[PDB]
Amino acid sequence: WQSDALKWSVLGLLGLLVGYLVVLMYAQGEYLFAITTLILSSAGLYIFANRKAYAWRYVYPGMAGMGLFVLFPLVCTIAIAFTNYSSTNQLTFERAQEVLLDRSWQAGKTYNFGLYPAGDEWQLALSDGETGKNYLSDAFKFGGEQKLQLKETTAQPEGERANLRVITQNRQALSDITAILPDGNKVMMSSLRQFSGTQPLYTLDGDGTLTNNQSGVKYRPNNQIGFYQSINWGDEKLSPGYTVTTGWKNFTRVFTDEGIQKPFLAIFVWTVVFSLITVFLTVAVGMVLACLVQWEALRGKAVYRVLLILPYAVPSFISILIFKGLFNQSFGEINMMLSALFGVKPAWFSDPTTARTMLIIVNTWLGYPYMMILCMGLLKAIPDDLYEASAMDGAGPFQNFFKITLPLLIKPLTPLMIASFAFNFNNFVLIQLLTNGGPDRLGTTTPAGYTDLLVNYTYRIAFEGGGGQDFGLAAAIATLIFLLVGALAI
Template sequence: MRSHQRTASILSVIIMGLGQLYNRQFVKGILLLCVEIMGGYYFVMRLPHAVWGLVTLGEVPTHLVKIGKRYKNVVGDHSVNLLIGGLVILILFALFVIVYVMNVRDAYRTGKQRDEGIAPSSFRASMSYVADRRFPQLLLTLPAISVLFLTIMPILMAVLLAFTNYSAPEHIPPAKLVDWVGFQTFIDLLSLKTWSHTFYGVFVWTVIWAVIATVTTYFGGLLVALLIDQKGIRFKGLWRSLFIIPYAIPQLISLLVMRNLFNGQFGPINQYLSYFGLGKVPWLTDPTWAKVTVILVNMWVGIPVSMVLILGVLTAIPKDMYEAAEVDGATAFQKLRVITLPFVFFATTPILITQFAGNINNFNVIFLLTNGDPVNGDYQYAGSTDLLVTWLYKLTLNNNKYNFASAIGIIIFVIVASLSIWSYRRSRSFKEEDMIQ
């Protein structure tokens, strides 16, 4: 009784499109058969070499061969190109397999319909169905493919580099080959003294920075929002506009201006201090003062963001709750503690977690204000104010230590993802999602 269903499925497994041809869907079957022929030919030619490249990362580097009195450049294998090419081929092969599975499922469903006495749909009817019922999925296909090749593939590339010895000067293609080393990069980063001292120092400062930067900007924004929201405050629109200006100005401009303002020799701030006999403060040249400076500047840039978010929450709190509290004789502090703060914390906890994760990777403030300086002689390619993300940047762009940079990137991801998921699952926003409906 299930002969069409079984036969169509088996034929589509053997060769893509045969099941559709058996089900008398000739246009669809021919198209899938063409995909099978082109894809099969392409992967037969490319897939073995791609797998070989991923496994070996090349065997012969580019080198010079002496021919008589001259030297000839012999082009060899390029490990990074083999790695990238292998990833692309494997992703394309995965997409081909997905299409193959969809082909089998389509033949199975159509064969089942034939067994139930339902005529197979024509190619035009199938296209009408896709355009009508599957139109959102159709539109999302191109963005999904773009994300696959422009986001996921580079991430996979960065992850794989952490398990190689791709770094200068010993292993830079094409003159040198890159090899797989497993977890050796992570072991060196965490245990080798020249690297571990820098990693632990930068890691501790990254955590301290993220905590202080998040707390100061959040509670600073909360304080400003509460002050503006008070009943006796006039010209609230003006106050909101004034405090939002630091956020409205592009961060690049703000930070470069701040860098000039805090210049130790010629900055206006030190000139004003010298007028009062206070001397010059090494804002950006002393390690401790540089860290204080980046925190202060981050408050200037970050408080307006928290202020705007919290003002939105304050306007959503029901006014009758305050009126009921006043009838019960509650003081202003009690209303703040019992009504305002719980609502604000409940609504902004996910945003607070996002800000904490963002501050761990806050590249702009550190790089544009101090460039990670002042220089720390005990650190490997890092300064006193460098975060893990800015240290990663220097290792990649300035020193070609790609394997260590990739390992640091993986560690950053693990830290941020773990802390974010853990803290969010412990928050009331997660436990009491239906509290405010």
């Protein structure tokens, strides 16, 4: 038997790591991570401390995982929706300011430089290209910020020219040198080969205002739109922009903008219908197959079983594109077979309804093994004597299925079906790869198509539509479609 004191020892040893990591997170600058890890660990320790919270010991590890990798990403997405986080406004203010302060302009001349040893010291040469004048410094030592008076010379330096290797090794010390020409000009290292009058484009005043050293124009943070704007505001706006809070602006835009609302209802209906038919067809196909493949009379079931789940063993990406090949109206082996037999070539892409049929056929092919595998296990929960009883009541195979097998399965399947509905509601990938949402809905001022899901039509507005990648908008619409599908499950 393991010690009883050992429980408090382990709980004490774990109670050490927490705090050792928490206060360590409190340092440098990780506050959000220190608060989150504290409440999470303390709950875990309390749960295993008192035996009154016994049930929670079973739930805690699983809920910890879920909170971390499902709920935390969920909250961030929602959080982002209240900001203008986009391609245009991707950086934080600090970063955006930093970027701008790293910007430079060429204020003066440009000189090719060489480095020449004088014993244990160095000598810096500059060459003026436009006058053919050459300048050379006195012997100096590397280290820290220093100013060198250069003198015009006709002579060559005594030392042999330094390698790129030597220039590179001494680059930091070299970059701290301000070279001074005989006429008063200052010049600093701008590359590994050149000294020049490169200078910062802006200077930070201290009260917030940035000013261009080339034009004299003054800019200030406009936290309403997230840009440094000229100054009371001027017409000019500096990029890069920074992420800033925009409240309801991203949510209201889905309600404000007519044109993005025109095909909403029509698209919604198709998305609902597409999901329902997918769930129905996959459950039905999968359930039957699972039933047939456990039937002990079926002498090939072990082989059948494996082959039936292969559409799910191969990554769906290639399969979808291959289906796109197979469904080609003029080419593609499906309509080449429907030409020989029956004699019809369906417009699997051109005609809205036949495209919807194609999409459902492919999705059922994709999704039936999911339901099949579930039923394969769920069927094992039905006791065999129920069918002995039904035999004594005079049931056949079809009667067995609809009066016993189906009803016993729909209850555990119910949550899985509601989930499968929500998943297929947002099946962006399938529609994109197969149809691109086509064929085209005519008259839609913001582009929409007949097989477009809600997600497909929406993320086109956010990530295409000529505005760059607007993450805040896509986050807001992700919240809205979530609230819609959550209201649907009722």
